[PDB]
């Protein structure tokens, strides 16, 4: 059965993501209920290629947290998953950055440099400043 | 006279940024009142080196819009301002990303790539997935 094999893969995925540490607190994603077993789904694209879908909820709805958790899920799974896979990840809510936090971001040199190196963003800017 | 040379400089800065196209709308920042003449301040850090401070307000408080306006201001003045300067930008409210927009972000190839290359974020991620 496709369906039961997909449930086996979802448990494998979950066993790898549960012990990822939160970007902010000294606890695991599982401990803080950012992820749980039911938040994973696996689908077949074609033999030898699976799509993994992970829903998660950061401890508070802040953009930088959501970004970082997304990065950790990809890094951990890319390194540790023993089958070829596409990954899609979804948060269940909008997020925000406080006045203080967004001003930090738009002035932080590392953050500015990374957006500048994004070819999609750099082209939008190119076209605004002409 | 320091004070008045600073006003001259703030008018030169303003004249450059007011014609920047908004990232989302078919208008300039000045038309949309994202910036105005009094939102620019210039200070002396020392001879041949001025701090330029720009306050702005995006048409709506969304993170991507604030990020892109910030980039455009920086590139514009980098390319056109005929004096050595440091730039600080400030938005006077927090911002948010809808559930739709934050999901696009955490799945978008270039956004993930750029974040991974930001040294602060990559070191955090390393520690979280170790
Ligand atoms: Zn908050
Ligand atoms: Zn945000
Ligand atoms: Zn909104």
Swiss-Prot record, chains A, B:
Subcellular locations according to the entry: Cytoplasm
Species this chain originates from: Homo sapiens (Human)
Binding residue positions for Zn(2+) 2: 62, 96, 123, 126
Keyword Metal-binding: yes
GO MF, one example: metal ion binding
Protein name: Cytosolic iron-sulfur assembly component 2A
Major site of localization recorded for this protein: cytoplasm
Higher taxonomy: Eukaryota, Metazoa, Chordata, Craniata, Vertebrata
Subunit field text: Monomer and homodimer. Component of the CIA complex. Interacts with CIAO1. Interacts with IREB2. Interacts with APAF1.
Top-level division of the source organism's lineage: Eukaryota
